[PDB]
Write a protein that binds this DNA or RNA. Sequence first.
RNA 1: ACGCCACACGGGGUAAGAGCUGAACGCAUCUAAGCUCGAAACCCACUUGGAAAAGAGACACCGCCGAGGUCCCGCGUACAAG
RNA 2: CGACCGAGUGGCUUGCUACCUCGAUGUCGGUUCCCUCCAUCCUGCCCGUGCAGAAGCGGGCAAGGGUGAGGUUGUUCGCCU
RNA 3: AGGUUAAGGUCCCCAAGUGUGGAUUAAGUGUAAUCCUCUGAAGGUGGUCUCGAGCCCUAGACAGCCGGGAGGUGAGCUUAGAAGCAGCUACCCUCUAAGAAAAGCGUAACAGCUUACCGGCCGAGGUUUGAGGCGCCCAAAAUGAUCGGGACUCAAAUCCACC
Lengths: 172, 142, 337, 132, 160
Amino acid sequence: PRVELEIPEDVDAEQDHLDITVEGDNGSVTRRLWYPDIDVSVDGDTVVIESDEDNAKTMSTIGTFQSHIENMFHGVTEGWEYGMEVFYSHFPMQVNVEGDEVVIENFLGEKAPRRTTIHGDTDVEIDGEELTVSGPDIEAVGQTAADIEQLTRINDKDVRVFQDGVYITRKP
Amino acid sequence: AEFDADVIVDARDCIMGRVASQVAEQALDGETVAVVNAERAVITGREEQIVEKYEKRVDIGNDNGYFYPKRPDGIFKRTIRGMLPHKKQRGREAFESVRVYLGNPYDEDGEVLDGTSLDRLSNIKFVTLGEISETLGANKTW
Amino acid sequence: PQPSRPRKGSLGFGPRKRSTSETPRFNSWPSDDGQPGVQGFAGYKAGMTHVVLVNDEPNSPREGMEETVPVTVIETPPMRAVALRAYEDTPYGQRPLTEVWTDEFHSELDRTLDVPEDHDPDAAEEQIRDAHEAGDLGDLRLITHTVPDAVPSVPKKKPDVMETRVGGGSVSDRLDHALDIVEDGGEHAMNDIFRAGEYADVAGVTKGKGTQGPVKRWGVQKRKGKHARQGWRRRIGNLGPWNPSRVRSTVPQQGQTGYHQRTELNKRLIDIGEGDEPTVDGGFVNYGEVDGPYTLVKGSVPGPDKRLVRFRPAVRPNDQPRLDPEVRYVSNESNQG
Amino acid sequence: MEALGADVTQGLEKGSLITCADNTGARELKVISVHGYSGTKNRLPKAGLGDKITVSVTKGTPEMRRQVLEAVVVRQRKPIRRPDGTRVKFEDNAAVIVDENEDPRGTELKGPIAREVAQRFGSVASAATMIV
Amino acid sequence: KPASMYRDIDKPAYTRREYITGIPGSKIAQHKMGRKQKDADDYPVQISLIVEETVQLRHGSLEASRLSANRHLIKELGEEGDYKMTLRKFPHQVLRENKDGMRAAFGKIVGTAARVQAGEQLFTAYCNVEDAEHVKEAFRRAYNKITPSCRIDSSPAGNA
RNA sequence: ACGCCACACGGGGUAAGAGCUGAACGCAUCUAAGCUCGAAACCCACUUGGAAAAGAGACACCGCCGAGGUCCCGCGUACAAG
RNA sequence: CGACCGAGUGGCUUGCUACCUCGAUGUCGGUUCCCUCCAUCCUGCCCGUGCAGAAGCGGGCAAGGGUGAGGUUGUUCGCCU
RNA sequence: AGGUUAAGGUCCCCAAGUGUGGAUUAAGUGUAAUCCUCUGAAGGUGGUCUCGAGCCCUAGACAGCCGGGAGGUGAGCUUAGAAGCAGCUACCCUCUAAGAAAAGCGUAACAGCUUACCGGCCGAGGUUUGAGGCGCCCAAAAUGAUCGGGACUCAAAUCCACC
Ligand SMILES: [Cl-]
Ligand SMILES: [Cl-]
Ligand SMILES: [Cl-]
Ligand SMILES: [Cl-]
Ligand SMILES: [Cl-]
Ligand SMILES: [Cl-]
Ligand SMILES: [K+]
Ligand SMILES: [Mg+2]
Ligand SMILES: [Mg+2]
Ligand SMILES: [Mg+2]
Ligand SMILES: [Mg+2]
Ligand SMILES: [Mg+2]
Ligand SMILES: [Mg+2]
Ligand SMILES: [Mg+2]
Ligand SMILES: [Mg+2]
Ligand SMILES: [Mg+2]
Ligand SMILES: [Mg+2]
Ligand SMILES: [Mg+2]
Ligand code: NA
Ligand code: NA
Ligand code: NA
Ligand code: NA
Ligand code: NA
Ligand code: NA
Ligand code: NA
Ligand code: NA
Ligand code: NA
Ligand code: NA
Ligand code: NA
Ligand code: NA
Ligand code: NA
Ligand code: NA
Ligand code: NA
């Protein structure tokens, strides 16, 4: 099989070895696409993903590579954006961006501040009780968002009653 | 230092056992062999089970002793000893006339033996000697 | 149903054999933080006394109050860094590259060493900087020796040689720092490295006790009750099960106890001084009179009186430093009574 | 528990007979267990100053006898060390009967007490005649 | 006791009641189920349960699997639904047990079992095209309670 | 000893598990490739031994008609002989 | 929580067998001292709940460490504090 | 004493192939004829490969996204109330390219959210079922793991042929 992806005018993609770099107005993203007998190349105006094998496992990965590359075309032009909301019941939770990480204080009345380091070139912008994660690398931005929601994880008590925390509101 | 090697082999990206078998073959034939770039040799398979075997070999032991090397120097030299009758005269000589190296202490580039190479483009399930050594707790001195 | 019980003694300090070097040899060094500097000093054990201190601990319900604390007295006269040895990074660990010596040597250094009569402090230094340029330089350590002659209570005049590491700022800066200390004459004191109130790791070769049995050596029980009267008083029950048909090295047996190397962590330095304020009436038992450069260490220290003990800045401190503790009293009462 | 503010060499064991320093009606008490303690194989469980122990009444009024009650150790013959080095020891071994909330069961204490016992059981100490 | 003790055919046929006394009664309540007054040819579909290995099935197993299959057909079709299942086997082989050591070891009578050769149909149900999926499920439960592996086979039914 | 002193934190990789991106299968999907985390457990950290590691090691100096050493003598920080 | 019926793993109990030893492989229980297994009692980290919380109940990973003192009885076992 | 085979074997240890045409397997499965000795079961598997049958499709199939999803009437009955949806019975005609006397949630009952059914965008195979191959789950034990060992993955495994 062979699938051909036409790269936008806005974008510019260059490849070295198994690594692919995609640069655009919103930034650049380099990934590593490695899988037995699948060839990724740049043919001037298009990206080519081809293989001599046609089995279920090869076909699975070929399709995966496509969606990864299309997401890279998007990140460099439009960019990716996840929006979150902070919600609390009794104790006033404090969410802030300190350094290259996001810190959360007074969660459920805690004394110890909960925190997490931001992934790569992701930009977290807070506005009152609303948050917005964004960047070109969908992998990086995606994790960063999820890590914020995972940060208010509670296992000891009933989640149905103790619903405090930041939650993913809008997914791109 | 200074090994007067008749042959210098490049183990980089080559299947360990297949290389080892040929080195043993030649050493018994009275050849002086130097395996180079051992940290970059390779062994195919699912990494989780490969390491489980090597870590198990480290735990084994008693007062009598079961010394098992953690660095790619030894792992390779031990693999080769396993293909040589090292407890005999002819076999000890052959074994002692073979040495493995981390990186390349020579000027020449080692030759690649037929059948021993692995195509990274065709395979994804394999591991590097150096990667096993790090999991074993060795000191990355390369 | 035979109750459970932890084994007798630890398998981490063996084999329990006589120490090779009476002079201890640190196998770990502090991290390169602040400015460059030598990471250790040495002295000779003298004896013990007690002192009265004001509670330093800010978290103690008694802070600011009087408190009696036991102290081991150690004479810490100046030593001499006679050389600068450099190591190189190779695929087989670190290896000694070259050394840089001096001309000014102690009058009795020749009781142990074959003192250098012809040397080249430049070629060596050059080789070190060339290697550093190559990015193959390992670490930097000074060869140091003590001056037993300064301590009258000690019979030996023949110095004790030891290699102490130097760490600090950049490799380049501490390389230079080292070279300076050496060239002078190598003279340095406890002040230059430690401050009163810091935590240190004291190493030493313990008091030898020759051959001893399992009860003492490993802390096993004595035979109890009726068993104690049959012919066995201080012997363990069995040397092992039927199978494996061999005696396992883990079973407690007789042998050499003491005269081993131990490194005791987090020893607090109470006071670094000079003179005879800490000396005891009638003299320290089996040692003598103290009057000069000394150090007061909290608690005990491995080894007998006169033995060489080594200092190193604590590699794993549990607490923060509380400098210069207020000492209100140093007992001078006789140790005979 | 809260720190005693002194070192203690436990002078009592499981089975020891001591003095009940109060007016509950009990005269002699026998130690049965020590609260919060867990020793090692073959070791006879130990108690000392400032410890809370489980006890049985050996002597006293007909009603108090054979009763299994809790108590607090107030005095002991084995020496203890104060923060200034000084050792302190008593004339006998004694404990005071106490309830669930650590309040003395009796109305009055008989004899002296260690100042250290106040840092743990204030309501017992706040009934002391002499605190040494 | 375990079926491991009687599942294989490793003894001669022991069915002559004229020489065997004290044989326990069968636990098999009924062999003809559903609507016994109606005919087998009066149904569009006919599915049988085929045994894959040659074995011995004790009356205890026959009752348990027959029960748990018909109980399903009664639950999904009713106590008087339109169907009729058939347990086409009867337990003829008598079983012993040596319950002294190996001296005078001939065992005493403890039970009965039906011998089924691989490829034979143990059960055979008859129903309309609608109830075809219920009979399959009823049989699924049935082969869960007998030793061998089984093939649920639809004989007359091309309405799949 | 019944007395007194000292005995981490932190990293790296995982299990169960929680997730991200993601296809076979336009959707969905924690997984098939890839990734972020995550156990008193694993590896490092720390302590102890360790040139007989047969690839039997490295550096500096003194010396090869003399450096150094054993014996001898007075003694123990050592010790059953050694 | 879980009957019936069906399929298994272990080799601690018990039974069967009579291969090894009758020119002897010293008994039970206990004690002392050493190593191990996991089918986990506690401790770490997890999942579900008839999970508000607090106290539980059930389940997963996990063998680093721990699992103690006494009264009757030779007891192993087991009953009791 | 010379020569050729048998069982068995030809990557090394170890004599002889890292032999040829082709296919499967990713578990180190396996590299274990027979066996006290080499285990692995009922039951389960959109792991992957090969094969057959039925039906749907460029007059646009399967899926996804958007739009529509209507009134007669909130059928009648039961009932204070029931209006698709408590229960009982019925289950009709209009509009139109579709739209149930309503399949599943939801309300105290309404509402509210979708299913059926029509249209659009899109554009290539889709869907149902039968059979076979290799593997995976099921799968816990005591001093140190194992196919004799090393180690092996388009094999040095497995099956069909061959030199
Ligand atoms: Cl070993
Ligand atoms: Cl051999
Ligand atoms: Cl692969
Ligand atoms: Cl004893
Ligand atoms: Cl107790
Ligand atoms: Cl393997
Ligand atoms: K016998
Ligand atoms: Mg709770
Ligand atoms: Mg006797
Ligand atoms: Mg004295
Ligand atoms: Mg005195
Ligand atoms: Mg006992
Ligand atoms: Mg014997
Ligand atoms: Mg388990
Ligand atoms: Mg253990
Ligand atoms: Mg050959
Ligand atoms: Mg296997
Ligand atoms: Mg077989
Ligand atoms: Na391999
Ligand atoms: Na080992
Ligand atoms: Na005797
Ligand atoms: Na005696
Ligand atoms: Na014996
Ligand atoms: Na008989
Ligand atoms: Na079955
Ligand atoms: Na960890
Ligand atoms: Na040597
Ligand atoms: Na069994
Ligand atoms: Na005999
Ligand atoms: Na015994
Ligand atoms: Na454990
Ligand atoms: Na008992
Ligand atoms: Na294997």
